[PDB]
Amino acid sequence: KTVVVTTILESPYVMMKKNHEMLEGNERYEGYCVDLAAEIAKHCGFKYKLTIVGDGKYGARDADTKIWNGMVGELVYGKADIAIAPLTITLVREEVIDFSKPFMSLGISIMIKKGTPIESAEDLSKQTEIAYGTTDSGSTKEFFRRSKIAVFDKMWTYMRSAEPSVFVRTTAEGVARVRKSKGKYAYLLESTMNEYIEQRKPCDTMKVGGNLDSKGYGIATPKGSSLGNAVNLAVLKLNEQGLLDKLKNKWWYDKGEC
Amino acid sequence: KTVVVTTILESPYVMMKKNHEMLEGNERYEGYCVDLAAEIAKHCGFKYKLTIVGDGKYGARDADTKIWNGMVGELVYGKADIAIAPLTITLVREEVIDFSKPFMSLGISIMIKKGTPIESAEDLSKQTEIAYGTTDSGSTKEFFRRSKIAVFDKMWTYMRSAEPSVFVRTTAEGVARVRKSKGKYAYLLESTMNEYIEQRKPCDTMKVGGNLDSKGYGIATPKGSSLGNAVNLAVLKLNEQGLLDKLKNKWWYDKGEC
Ligand SMILES: Cc1onc(O)c1C[C@H](N)C(=O)O
Numbered sequence: 001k002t003v004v005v006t007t008i009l010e011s012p013y014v015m016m017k018k019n020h021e022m023l024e025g026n027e028r029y030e031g032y033c034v035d036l037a038a039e040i041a042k043h044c045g046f047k048y049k050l051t052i053v054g055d056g057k058y059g060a061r062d063a064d065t066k067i068w069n070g071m072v073g074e075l076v077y078g079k080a081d082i083a084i085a086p087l088t089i090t091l092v093r094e095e096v097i098d099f100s101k102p103f104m105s106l107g108i109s110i111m112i113k114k115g116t117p118i119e120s121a122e123d124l125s126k127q128t129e130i131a132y133g134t135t136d137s138g139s140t141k142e143f144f145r146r147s148k149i150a151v152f153d154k155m156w157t158y159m160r161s162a163e164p165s166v167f168v169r170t171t172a173e174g175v176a177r178v179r180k181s182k183g184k185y186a187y188l189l190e191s192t193m194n195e196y197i198e199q200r201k202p203c204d205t206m207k208v209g210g211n212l213d214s215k216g217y218g219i220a221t222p223k224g225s226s227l228g229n230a231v232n233l234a235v236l237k238l239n240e241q242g243l244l245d246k247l248k249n250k251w252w253y254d255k256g257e258c
Numbered sequence: 259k260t261v262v263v264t265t266i267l268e269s270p271y272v273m274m275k276k277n278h279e280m281l282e283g284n285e286r287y288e289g290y291c292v293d294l295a296a297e298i299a300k301h302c303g304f305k306y307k308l309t310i311v312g313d314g315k316y317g318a319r320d321a322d323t324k325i326w327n328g329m330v331g332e333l334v335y336g337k338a339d340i341a342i343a344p345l346t347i348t349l350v351r352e353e354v355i356d357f358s359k360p361f362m363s364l365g366i367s368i369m370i371k372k373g374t375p376i377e378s379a380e381d382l383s384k385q386t387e388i389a390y391g392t393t394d395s396g397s398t399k400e401f402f403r404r405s406k407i408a409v410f411d412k413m414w415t416y417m418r419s420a421e422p423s424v425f426v427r428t429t430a431e432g433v434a435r436v437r438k439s440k441g442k443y444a445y446l447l448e449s450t451m452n453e454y455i456e457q458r459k460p461c462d463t464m465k466v467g468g469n470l471d472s473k474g475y476g477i478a479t480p481k482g483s484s485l486g487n488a489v490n491l492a493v494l495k496l497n498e499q500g501l502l503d504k505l506k507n508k509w510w511y512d513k514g515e516c
């Protein structure tokens with residue numbers, strides 16, 4: 001009956017309201033994906049329950065274990081019926097789960113502490129004084145691991161050998177590292193997140209260079225699930241009606257700080 | 259069995275080579291979508307023949323006969339196995355055929371002569387001194403006809419009532435009008451074409467402001483087609499390897515005669 005929705009606490013997509021301890025159920029959370037979920041549910045006609053991914057990961061197939069983790073894993077192994085969050089549509093994921101057409105565009109980007117002498121991925125690839133890395137178990141790390149493009153492959157080789165580890169468990173960890181490393185740590189995360197944080201206090205970070213790639217987020221369901229078709233059409237419907245646009249403007253600019 | 263590919267003549271997507279009369283088969287054609295077809299065939303392992311859609315339409319259902327025309331029609335009625343062209347993924351189409359994840363992003367945009375005082379659709383709707391319109395048929399006009407959002411509905415009512423008519427028979431006519439109207443005419447069309455023209459002599463037009471909507475072109479196949487899965491994975495793979503970006507640069511930015 002009730003659709004189990006797996007998501008992740010990632011501002012401004014999903015976050016607990018300040019007064020959450022005084023609320024209940026889905027009302028405890030707020031954000032882009034929270035509004036999106038309510039929209040998808042309404043158009044598809046189902047009741048749902050927002051649940052936070054247990055391991056706090058987006059999703060990757062562990063090397064050796066071969067087991068999928070994160071929101072992808074929850075879908076693959078029967079823990080959730082649908083994933084509504086900033087989950088990147090990728091080849092490896094599409095092979096084990098279904099994705100609706102994209103509801104938002106984005107690209108891998110670089111976040112630096114203001115003043116860091118870096119302007120591009122190429123700049124990063126040429127040196128080591130300023131360490132750089134990305135988040136574990138997601139599409140960004142996989143991108144560098146698989147890229148055959150000169151600059152990116154060099155960066156991957158760099159990351160694997162850099163000490164101490166340049167990888168972080170979460171976006172929060174990555175951003176905190178950038179802010180506390182006095183310009184010696186650059187973080188590779190998606191443009192959506194980079195731009196949001198940039199316009200928020202303490203206004204000490206900034207996106208540099210253009211995006212490294214072009215892709216999108218999609219709503220994911222277990223492979224072959226009957227929910228896919230309806231969900232896919234709803235997303236196209238919301239986009240065509242201009243709702244997804246209003247949603248982004250609301251969560252990315254209607255609340256800016258810097 | 260040779261795969262029947264339906265496409266449409268539209269620059270710079272598909273065009274007959276200047277010396278086509280000296281070539282044969284698929285070799286007569288050139289363009290972004292011709293190159294794309296080659297990449298997909300290679301990744302999916304199939305032989306194919308490029309055929310040009312008979313009615314020169316993209317894909318719409320007649321409200322009276324309920325018949326689908328264009329490339330979508332050829333797939334719906336089983337006359338072609340796959341459509342590779344600048345065919346936009348839409349709700350109504352997704353209901354009758356299958357679309358791979360998008361291979362190129364776009365949106366309705368404004369084309370102006372360099373120098374005209376217009377920076378957005380909002381600006382256009384608030385004035386009349388600078389006339390603006392769309393092609394007398396097609397997805398852009400249909401977008402405005404159906405739009406329920408304030409700004410666009412106002413633009414539609416203006417366009418429908420404006421005299422002399424602000425509509426043009428073809429894209430070429432629209433761009434010509436922009437170039438000869440000394441800044442008194444703005445043309446609304448797909449961002450992709452806008453960007454292409456902006457890169458060509460005489461370099462007197464420019465794309466301005468943000469797009470009015472966000473969507474993407476996708477490779478289409480009949481519902482339940484065995485080719486669907488592979489083609490979708492091929493697009494994702496081509497994108498992840500940076501091949502799609504290289505292709506756009508080849509046909510848009512490397513050859514930009516500006
Ligand atoms: C959000 C986000 O921002 N930077 C990132 O790498 C991510 C995670 C990415 N969307 C994934 O699906 O792995």
Ligand SMILES: Cc1onc(O)c1C[C@H](N)C(=O)O
Pocket residue numbers: 268316317344345346347396397398448451
């Ligand atoms: C190309 C093109 O240019 N303007 C247009 O409307 C189109 C066709 C549009 N992309 C469709 O699929 O209907």
